[PDB]
């Protein structure tokens, strides 16, 4: 059986779908991953995956998300129109080859790909890369129950700052809010609704959505073949192997978020004076905002500054004591499933809500208070590395790690749901 997979062209959307594809290929399915030209330019390793990679045009002018940032309203619709045309053309080509495609798993943020799947005679599966708790907000947004203290069914009481952040996007704010709510615009017509979460993590909201539509919780999809992009694996893991247990702060703001030069100074000085060992991912295009001699010498005593790391392998390493994170869902879930407590500095979109869930529901991290000054960051490091509170957060993270292991092992909710999905296709 031949499965097609089409993530949104950003790493936090590609990676969790890639991990699901790797699981499905292990069960015997043929996988074709559909990527933009822009994404393929960053792909460095793929041979070991055995997955076919097929590229489509970017569909907007010539990094594709940085062109999209210039005018989200216009360029997301241009990307949509081009994606519809070019995925149609690609499927038409794939229909001249055996085995014929049978299902298209597509990013939930591109709900209009469902029309392409059905027009081509394929089943359509929408893949949600955010937790059900956050996705629920987007549904209520579409229904008009909420726009842009807040009570919503089966969610903790939220402060305004805890709702998904779109005001940060300025003139793009309206376009981004529309994109998020539209994830539910055709949910009744989707053949399969997949969420990268596990039931025990959000019992009540999963049960609530399950009462409206049959949904399949299949997360964590995360488990070499684990990475498509350059991860600097040998440098990172040789350095971690030199650190004792529970001594390293891992720091990453993901694949998209950019901090101002003012904000990165506060992070830099906070890390130096904590006198903690640290591994800080600073993307190549963001290095020029680091203080003068930070990467070259003053970080050399206690730190590793790297433009990308193998995040799954880093979070699994016993040396890592905590994870200073922007709270994107992959990072949150990967830390939770690795037993690693967090320092939350959310930037925008669902990160704000994820940070609330981390601190107050799952209780595996602490939040910083706003610019975030270095003094606040060092305080949070002390709470997690030294204080009794940090030992509680660590124990809580280990309990969630155990429940996530249960979910993906035989008999667990996510294993059962991936089995149900696989069997449905046969
Ligand atoms: C506005 C934004 C801000 C961050 C970067 O500057 C990139 C731009 C354009 C791309 C845009 C992000 C803001 C976040 C996004 C809506 C993000 C998504 C979040 C989601 O749930 O579905 C898509 C992917 C990337 C995104 O489409
Ligand atoms: O040095 C890094 C930093 C991040 N990641 C991966 O990049 C994705 C980050 O996604 P997330 O949802 O956390 O945030 P986003 O980048 O979408 O804002 C995840 O797959 C991380 O595992 C990584 O492999 N190496």
Q: How many of the other CB atoms lie within 10 Å of CB of 67?
A: 16
Please provide the CATH number assigned to the domain covering 2-225+406-424: 3.40.50.2000
| d(C-alpha 114, C-alpha 104), whole Å | 8
Task: Determine the 3-state secondary structure of 125 from DSSP.
Answer: strand
**Residue 395 CB partners (closer than 8 Å, separation 6+):** none
Distance 331 CA to ligand 2 centre (A): 6
Structural tokens at position 49: 């995956």
For residue 228, the ligand closest to its alpha carbon is 2
- Enter the resolution in angstroms: 1.8
Q: Which of 331, 334, 345, 349 to mutate to test the pocket of ligand 2 (most atoms within 8 A of CB)?
A: 331
Residue 242, Ramachandran bin (φ over 0: left; ψ between -120 and 50: alpha; else beta):
alpha
Decide whether any atom of ligand 1 lies within 6 Å of the 8 Cβ.
Answer: yes
Whole-angstrom CA distances from 86 to 2, 91, 139 are 19, 9, 29
Distance 188 CA to ligand 2 centre (A): 30
Residue ranges of the domains in the chain? Answer: 2-225+406-424, 233-405
Angle at 391 between CA 388 and CA 393, to 5 degrees: 110
* Same fold? 2-225+406-424, 233-405: yes
CB 103 within 8 A of CB 30: no
For residue 229, the ligand closest to its alpha carbon is 2
3-state secondary structure 291-346: CCCHHHHHCCCCEEEECCCCHHHHHCCCCEEEEEECCCHHHHHHHHHHCCCEEECC
Distance 172 CA to ligand 1 centre (A): 10
- Which residues' Cβ are closer than 6 Å to ligand 2? 10-12, 15, 252, 254-257, 281, 308-309, 311, 328-331, 334
Angle between helices 388-408 and 413-424 (to 10 degrees): 30
What is the secondary structure of 212-236 as a DSSP string? TS--EE--------S-SS---HHHH
Atom of ligand 2 nearest to the CA of 254: 16
- Per DSSP, 251 falls in state E
For atom 3 of ligand 2, the residue with the nearest CA is 254
| d(C-alpha 9, C-alpha 56), whole Å | 11
Atom of ligand 2 nearest to the CA of 229: 24
Whole-angstrom CA distances from 218 to 18, 51, 357 are 13, 20, 20
Could you identify the residue written with the tokens 């994830």? 183
Dihedral sign from CA coordinates of 291, 292, 296, 300: negative
What is the secondary structure of 245-289 as a DSSP string? TT-EEEEE-TTT----HHHHHHHHHHHHHTT-EEEEE--GGGGGG
Residue 170, Ramachandran bin (φ over 0: left; ψ between -120 and 50: alpha; else beta):
left
| d(C-alpha 361, C-alpha 371), whole Å | 25
Atom of ligand 1 nearest to the CA of 107: 22
Angle at 62 between CA 59 and CA 64, to 5 degrees: 65
Q: How many of the other CB atoms lie within 10 Å of CB of 280?
A: 23
Decide whether any atom of ligand 1 lies within 6 Å of the 10 Cβ.
Answer: yes
For residue 338, the ligand closest to its alpha carbon is 2
Distance 212 CA to ligand 1 centre (A): 28
- Quickly count helices (H) and strands (E) in the chain: 16, 13
Q: How many of the other CB atoms lie within 10 Å of CB of 232?
A: 15
Whole-angstrom CA distances from 326 to 69, 133, 165, 265, 419 are 19, 18, 13, 16, 33
Structural tokens at position 330: 């992959």
- Per DSSP, 99 falls in state S
CB 32 within 8 A of CB 13: no
Q: Does the N-terminal peptide bond of residue 328 adopt cis geometry, omega within 30 degrees of 0?
A: no
- Per DSSP, 358 falls in state I
Atom of ligand 2 nearest to the CA of 227: 24
Task: Determine the 3-state secondary structure of 45 from DSSP.
Answer: coil
Experimental method: X-ray
Structural tokens at position 190: 């989707």
Structural tokens at position 324: 């200073």
Task: Determine the 3-state secondary structure of 389 from DSSP.
Answer: helix
Residue among 136, 95, 152 nearest 119 (CA): 95
| d(C-alpha 190, C-alpha 155), whole Å | 25
Atom of ligand 2 nearest to the CA of 334: 22
Q: Is 80 exposed, middle or buried (0-12, 13-18, 19+ CB in 10 A)?
A: middle
Q: Max alpha carbon distance in the chain (Å)? A: 63
User: H or E element: which one contains 3?
Assistant: strand 2-6
Angle between helices 374-385 and 261-273 (to 10 degrees): 40
**What is the second-level CATH architecture of the domain 233-405?**
3-Layer(aba) Sandwich (3.40)
Atom of ligand 1 nearest to the CA of 350: 21
Distance 178 CA to ligand 1 centre (A): 12
Backbone angles phi, psi at 10, to 5 degrees: -150, 150
User: H or E element: which one contains 376?
Assistant: helix 374-385
């Amino acid at each position: 059986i031949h499965i097609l997979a089409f993530p949104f062209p950003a790493k936090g959307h590609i990676n969790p779908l890639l991990h699901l594809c790797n699981r499905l290929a292990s069960k015997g399915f043929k996988i074709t991953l559909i990527t933009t030209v822009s994404t393929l330019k960053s792909v460095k390793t793929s041979k070991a995956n055995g997955i076919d990679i097929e590229s489509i045009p970017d569909g907007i002018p010539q990094q594709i998300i940085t062109v999209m940032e210039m005018n989200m309203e216009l360029y997301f619709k241009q990307f949509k129109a081009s994606a519809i045309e070019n995925t149609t053309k690609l499927i038409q080509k794939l229909k001249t080859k055996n085995p014929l495609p049978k299902v298209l798993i597509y990013d939930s943020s591109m709900p209009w790909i469902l029309e392409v799947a059905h027009e081509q005679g394929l089943l359509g599966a929408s893949f949600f890369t955010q937790p059900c708790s956050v996705s629920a907000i987007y549904y209520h947004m579409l229904q008009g129950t909420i726009k842009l203290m807040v009570s919503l069914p089966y969610l903790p009481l939220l402060e305004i700052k805890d709702l998904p952040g779109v005001q940060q996007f300025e003139d793009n704010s309206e376009a981004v809010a529309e994109l998020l709510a539209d994830q539910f615009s055709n949910i009744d017509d989707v053949d399969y609704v997949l969420f990268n979460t596990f039931d025990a993590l959000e019992i009540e909201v999963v049960n609530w959505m399950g009462s409206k539509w049959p949904i399949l919780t299949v997360g964590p999809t995360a488990p070499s073949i684990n990475y498509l992009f350059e991860t600097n694996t040998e440098v990172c893991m040789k350095w971690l192997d030199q650190r004792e247990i529970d001594t390293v702060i891992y720091v990453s703001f993901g694949s998209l978020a950019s901090l101002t030069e003012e904000q990165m100074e506060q992070v830099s000085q906070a890390l130096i004076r904590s006198n903690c060992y640290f591994l800080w991912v600073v993307r190549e295009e963001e290095e020029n905002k680091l203080p003068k001699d930070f990467k070259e010498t003053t970080s050399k005593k206690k730190g590793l500054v790297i433009n990308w790391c193998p995040q799954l392998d880093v979070l699994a390493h016993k040396s890592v004591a905590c994870f200073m994170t922007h709270c994107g869902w992959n990072s949150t879930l990967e830390a939770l499933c690795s037993g690693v407590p967090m320092i939350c500095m959310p930037q925008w979109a669902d990160q704000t809500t994820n940070a609330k869930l981390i601190e107050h529901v799952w209780k595996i991290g602490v939040g910083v208070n706003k610019i975030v000054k270095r003094e606040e960051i060092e305080d949070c490091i002390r709470q997690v590395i030294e204080s009794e509170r940090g030992k509680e957060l660590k124990r809580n993270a280990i309990k969630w790690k155990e429940l996530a292991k249960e979910a993906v092992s035989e008999g667990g909710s996510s294993c059962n749901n991936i089995q149900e999905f696989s069997s449905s296709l046969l």
